[PDB]
Amino acid sequence: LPNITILATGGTIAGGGDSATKSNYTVGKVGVENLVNAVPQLKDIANVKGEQVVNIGSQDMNDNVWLTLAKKINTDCDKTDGFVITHGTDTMEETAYFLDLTVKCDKPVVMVGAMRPSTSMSADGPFNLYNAVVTAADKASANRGVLVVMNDTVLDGRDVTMTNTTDVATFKSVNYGPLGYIHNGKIDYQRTPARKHTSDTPFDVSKLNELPKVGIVYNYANASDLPAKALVDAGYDGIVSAGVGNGNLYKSVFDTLATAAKTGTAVVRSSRVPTGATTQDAEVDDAKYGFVASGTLNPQKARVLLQLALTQTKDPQQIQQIFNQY
Amino acid sequence: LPNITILATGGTIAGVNAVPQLKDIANVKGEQVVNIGSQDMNDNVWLTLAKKINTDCDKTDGFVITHGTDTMEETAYFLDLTVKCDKPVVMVGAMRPSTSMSADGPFNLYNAVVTAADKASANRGVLVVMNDTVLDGRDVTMTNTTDVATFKSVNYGPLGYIHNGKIDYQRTPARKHTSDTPFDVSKLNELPKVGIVYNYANASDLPAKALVDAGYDGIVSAGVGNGNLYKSVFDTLATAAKTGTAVVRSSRVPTGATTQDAEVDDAKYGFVASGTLNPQKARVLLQLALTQTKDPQQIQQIFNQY
Amino acid sequence: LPNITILATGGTIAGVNAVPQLKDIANVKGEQVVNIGSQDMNDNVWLTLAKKINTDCDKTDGFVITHGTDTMEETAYFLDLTVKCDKPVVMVGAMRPSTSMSADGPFNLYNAVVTAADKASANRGVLVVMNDTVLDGRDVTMTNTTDVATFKSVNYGPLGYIHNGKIDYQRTPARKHTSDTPFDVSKLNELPKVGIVYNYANASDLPAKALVDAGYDGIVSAGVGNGNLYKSVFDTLATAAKTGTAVVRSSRVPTGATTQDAEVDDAKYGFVASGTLNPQKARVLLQLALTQTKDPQQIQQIFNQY
Amino acid sequence: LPNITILATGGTIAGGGDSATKSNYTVGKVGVENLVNAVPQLKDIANVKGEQVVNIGSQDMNDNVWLTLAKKINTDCDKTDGFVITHGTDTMEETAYFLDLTVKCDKPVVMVGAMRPSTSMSADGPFNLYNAVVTAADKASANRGVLVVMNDTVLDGRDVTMTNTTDVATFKSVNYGPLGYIHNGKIDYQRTPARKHTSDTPFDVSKLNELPKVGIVYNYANASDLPAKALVDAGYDGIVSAGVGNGNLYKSVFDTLATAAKTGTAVVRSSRVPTGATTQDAEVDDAKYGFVASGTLNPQKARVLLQLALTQTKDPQQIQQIFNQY
Numbered sequence A, D: 001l002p003n004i005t006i007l008a009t010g011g012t013i014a015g016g017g018d019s020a021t022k023s024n025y026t027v028g029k030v031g032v033e034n035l036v037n038a039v040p041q042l043k044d045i046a047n048v049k050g051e052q053v054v055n056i057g058s059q060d061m062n063d064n065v066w067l068t069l070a071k072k073i074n075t076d077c078d079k080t081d082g083f084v085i086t087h088g089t090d091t092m093e094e095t096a097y098f099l100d101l102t103v104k105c106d107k108p109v110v111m112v113g114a115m116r117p118s119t120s121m122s123a124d125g126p127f128n129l130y131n132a133v134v135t136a137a138d139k140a141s142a143n144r145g146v147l148v149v150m151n152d153t154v155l156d157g158r159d160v161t162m163t164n165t166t167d168v169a170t171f172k173s174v175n176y177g178p179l180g181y182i183h184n185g186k187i188d189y190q191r192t193p194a195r196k197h198t199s200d201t202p203f204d205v206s207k208l209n210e211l212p213k214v215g216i217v218y219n220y221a222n223a224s225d226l227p228a229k230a231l232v233d234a235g236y237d238g239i240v241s242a243g244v245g246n247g248n249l250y251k252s253v254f255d256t257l258a259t260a261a262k263t264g265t266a267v268v269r270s271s272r273v274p275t276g277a278t279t280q281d282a283e284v285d286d287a288k289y290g291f292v293a294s295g296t297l298n299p300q301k302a303r304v305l306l307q308l309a310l311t312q313t314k315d316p317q318q319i320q321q322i323f324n325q326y
Numbered sequence B, C: 001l002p003n004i005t006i007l008a009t010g011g012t013i014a015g016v017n018a019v020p021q022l023k024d025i026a027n028v029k030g031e032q033v034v035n036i037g038s039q040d041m042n043d044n045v046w047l048t049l050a051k052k053i054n055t056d057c058d059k060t061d062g063f064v065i066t067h068g069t070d071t072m073e074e075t076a077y078f079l080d081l082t083v084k085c086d087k088p089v090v091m092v093g094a095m096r097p098s099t100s101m102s103a104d105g106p107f108n109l110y111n112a113v114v115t116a117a118d119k120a121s122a123n124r125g126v127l128v129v130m131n132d133t134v135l136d137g138r139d140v141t142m143t144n145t146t147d148v149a150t151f152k153s154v155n156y157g158p159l160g161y162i163h164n165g166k167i168d169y170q171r172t173p174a175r176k177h178t179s180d181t182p183f184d185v186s187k188l189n190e191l192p193k194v195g196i197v198y199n200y201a202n203a204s205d206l207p208a209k210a211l212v213d214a215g216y217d218g219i220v221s222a223g224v225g226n227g228n229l230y231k232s233v234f235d236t237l238a239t240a241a242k243t244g245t246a247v248v249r250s251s252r253v254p255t256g257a258t259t260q261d262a263e264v265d266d267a268k269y270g271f272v273a274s275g276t277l278n279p280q281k282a283r284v285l286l287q288l289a290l291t292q293t294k295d296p297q298q299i300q301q302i303f304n305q306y
């Protein structure tokens, strides 16, 4: 059977509360060993080996843990047949895209979490973790980029996102759909991401100590410019706008970001709306302002790529093409 | 036929006399309140709107507000809390330009008037009418950046559907709206200042710090997951909450409630959970909450009733 | 604590004492009505169920029926029309086996009892509780073949959501249910025979002809699109409708209403449109309709009220 | 500019009523010329040429019009750059899969319809037809199988289905998602169907006068066996079961179909549930009864493939593998 390495980072999957029937819980508590041992059918499918990288709620996820992950995967690739990453749900979609863009290891990387704590009634984490291992074990799982496996479904790291605050079925690829569904330890793959991932990207984080500073500002009625001016004041390399409708900006925020674009700060228009693309050739003349439209990337996802794009270039045409390729 | 007033505010739907069939169903009069893209919607326009409706209630049988799509869901919930008129107030926009192939606005307009003119639309609170669907102003939101079908009530579903100029209503909002709220805006010309801050991995506390240093009355967090806060942001908001800033935890996730009794002790920090109100909606309620009270506990009870 | 009765009927959820925490919230007693996979659910079981509930109403504070997922949506709507008891009747199943990794049944059961035991669950009609959600028995249906999240109220949304053993209710069904229906099943031991036929390109009229030649009391069509009929099937049903067979046009499409005033003159052929009732749900109502009347017009008014 | 051939078959796209504001209408009325001329921007993107094959509502769609379509496309391929097929909505998802399995022409085939009649206020048909032509005109549209284009979205012929009786946004690929979204006459493709289509299939309808007879039976509580016995009585080559939950059968229907399988009639278990697969290795021992599980194919779609499978083989193992390949 295949050798699978579990890289644990915390999350509710490793979370606990004092009642099986109360919602209250704390994160970053339980070690990887408890998790493996809570799925004594893992023996049937793989030779599992658990390593604890960090133990944090993914709400406190950060650039350094991302860097740690990518270098460790890229370093350890020759040592295992596959990777599963146990992680909190909240920022799983950010980390999954980060690794999707930066892992060069040609073996599957499957992220997994849980929407109920390990201690809860009908906790979702055991079966999720099993299906993660199945997916990382499956030869057909290779050359699909970095994956998330939640609720019996294999979802590509780019499109994958939370749709609901609490639903075990929360994770969906809301724009282009899942890669495959899982039944009885077997996967019927009908799709693969077309945008470039993993070893077909330029992004090489092996020698990086940090990542460019990119912030996110929200739009809404009577929006303040003070958040945008804060980030510009602090010399942020990039700002992503979580726009209204199709990436549109409140006039005060617009004005601030327009000025910023012209002094070298990279500016990406995304949208606070949960599906569909922030397009070029709508209400914002991007070329004029030196803005970038995010396409289907939501604000937190557009942040990931803009940060990586800023390790290669500061030219907004080069960054726009990156946002059309990756 | 009923008398129906259009209150125009701009939006893509204007960019009456193109829809001659409205004569079949109502006597309409149009009145320009403002003319702006709703990405630039603001407190003053909202205040004008609520006041106008409240004042002109008796003089018409229902209201249709033409509006941009970008922020219609916000203007909708504001009016849903502030309109005291018991006659239908119906909002409508268009996702395609007035001059484009298969423009949605005409039939959208048509159906908004059908809804405004239906006696059973009464006492359901302020409504959004888009894509043959009647949607309550609290839960209504955009789902897609460009889809004509974008407006959905994503947590509790629509009030009804519109076919052949009739509506089969199957639901009404339970949360208190319009004349059952204590919010009264008739004497106000500014609203408490309330900002939104975004959470994500390695989130800067800079936005939150900048609203705190401006003396904002409230801050809505667009949390990760079930309304969770990146550590720097958590730290800044925890301070804000005891230093005279109201603090609502909402979510960047498009559906489900930001709940109490998960990972954050709201009571200890003095925070409020938004329930199913997304960050822009939680803002609206928060502004109006702040006209009644500054106590977190009292603000939590408002977020629980409305 | 309230008294809550489980009425067991089989299903995957059994394949009480595994859920010791139910003692925290109720005093339960269990009673085996039948033990079958719900793919074999039938009229007799339905009749037993309605009678049992109606009779034992006064003796308990609410009801939880454990059931297969396959046809729970049918049993749900049957009971929603026939239960006269005003106390909560809550249905629950499980999409994963009782012995499987992360089985859903325990917490499903738990939450069904929370719902059965909530005083605000009263007078909302018969309910399905699945995946932390309360769902009205009329609109509730499967969306997915294996997903734990499969049960949704696909046209009008859920009644509420369940978190930390409390429900925030935001909606109630408007269509008349339970004690507001004229259906009374207390003296019946068979139901009018009603069949379903499927439409698609080059559809055979053979199924429809075979139910007609058996003297069926009704036929539900699973139409294409907005309840449209392949020509052969149309021809057979048109004949049936004037020869003493009730004919309801529903749709194979999972959402939206099968409407009047589209391409079919229902009045001319003597047909009924199902509105939002899918074919299996339209069947239920049709059966009960046929215990009151055989006139199409009267049957259309029932499909419009319930 | 590209040469595009419009093959008209009727539908509401070519439907009309006497009021712009009433729902009533009749189908199979308006010719292809009115349609082209109702989109006077078609000039900007292609040299269009309209041919009327039939003029029917798609509720009266049938095997012979399918056969006509496939032979005509396969015959005329060298004469145009692309095909658009105007068709009713109701059975578009059946015809799109039929052609997906039987077109050998290596140029795009794009189906399009409309949920409001041509005469209606804000009728959807003009813009749909424009986006159909854009899609058929796009070089990137090739090697994706037969497509449907509705509401600004490009959907693969296999997964595409109606989700709502009346919504202009009704058509979705409910299991695996769309191929691409359309903005301002341009398409950003991120997916292609993995299952075998067009010239990578065995199905060759060039010399076929008819198709094997396959019927569909519905399951529900207290289901009658009389529909199933009718089709078996008439010597049907195949029966598809629109099962309950995961392809399950009411015991009377089961019994009839079990008997039928054993006397040579092909039997496919599908599901009346609108998403997710009818799986092997659940509550039905398929191998034992000589049944076939449909996977993600819904009843009407499983009918299409079972009919084509029955032009090649009657062996239920061969048909099961076809249902795993196509």
Ligand SMILES: N[C@@H](CC(=O)O)C(=O)O
Pocket (backbone or CB within 6 Å): A010, A011, A012, A013, A027, A056, A057, A058, A059, A087, A088, A089, A090, A091, A113, A114, A115, A116, B225, B228, B263
């Ligand atoms: N806050 C948790 C939520 C979860 O994992 O379910 C996390 O993302 O770490």
Ligand SMILES: N[C@@H](CC(=O)O)C(=O)O
Pocket (backbone or CB within 6 Å): A245, A248, A283, B010, B011, B012, B013, B036, B037, B038, B039, B067, B068, B069, B070, B071, B093, B094, B095, B096
């Ligand atoms: N930006 C426009 C979008 C629209 O209405 O379609 C507005 O909201 O004013």
Ligand SMILES: N[C@@H](CC(=O)O)C(=O)O
Pocket (backbone or CB within 6 Å): C010, C011, C012, C013, C036, C037, C038, C039, C067, C068, C069, C070, C071, C093, C094, C095, C096, D245, D248, D283
């Ligand atoms: N066939 C089973 C499916 C389940 O309950 O999960 C039943 O309905 O009895």
Ligand SMILES: N[C@@H](CC(=O)O)C(=O)O
Pocket (backbone or CB within 6 Å): C225, C228, C263, D010, D011, D012, D013, D027, D056, D057, D058, D059, D087, D088, D089, D090, D091, D113, D114, D115, D116
């Ligand atoms: N019955 C029509 C419906 C439509 O096209 O909108 C058809 O499929 O032909």
